User: Fold FYVE, RhoGEF and PH domain-containing protein 6 from Homo sapiens.
Amino acid sequence: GSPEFIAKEIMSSEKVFVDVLKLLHIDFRDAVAHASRQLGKPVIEDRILNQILYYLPQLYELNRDLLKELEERMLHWTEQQRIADIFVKKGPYLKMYSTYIKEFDKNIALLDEQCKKNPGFAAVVREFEMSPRCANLALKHYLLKPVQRIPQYRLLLTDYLKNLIEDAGDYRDTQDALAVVIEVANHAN
Assistant:
């Protein structure tokens, strides 16, 4: 059925998106930590790294849990055809993507500055980008994914709503979830 197919695509694309958040918050951060242990001192100041990886601990925790809830829903779809309440519940936290989007250009410029002016950090970034984990895509490519994810939620939830029955089941929560994600998406303007 169309609603289940679209909900499955929300889940499957969320698996990929959470893997990007892992790449940034866990794998890249671990690479910096590894270089810092090799050197015996931080290769970059924590406060600067955390601004480059802006809100990534919060976003990783938020979407890791969103994903696991979606996975539970899709495993039990026969008995309960609902996903949108999960987005509505997490609304206050999804609003963190608004500041992520609004600060993106400044935080990418900070990444660029730090790679040009801090050679130990530049080396970690380049070696990570060339590693199989990144597959020779720049860190900025992955840091853009949260910006791109919010319009994807909008498209997917709009298609989901189109295939629901009015004022039954997940319909009203899908409307409210769409309102949350549109408010976030507008910060790209």
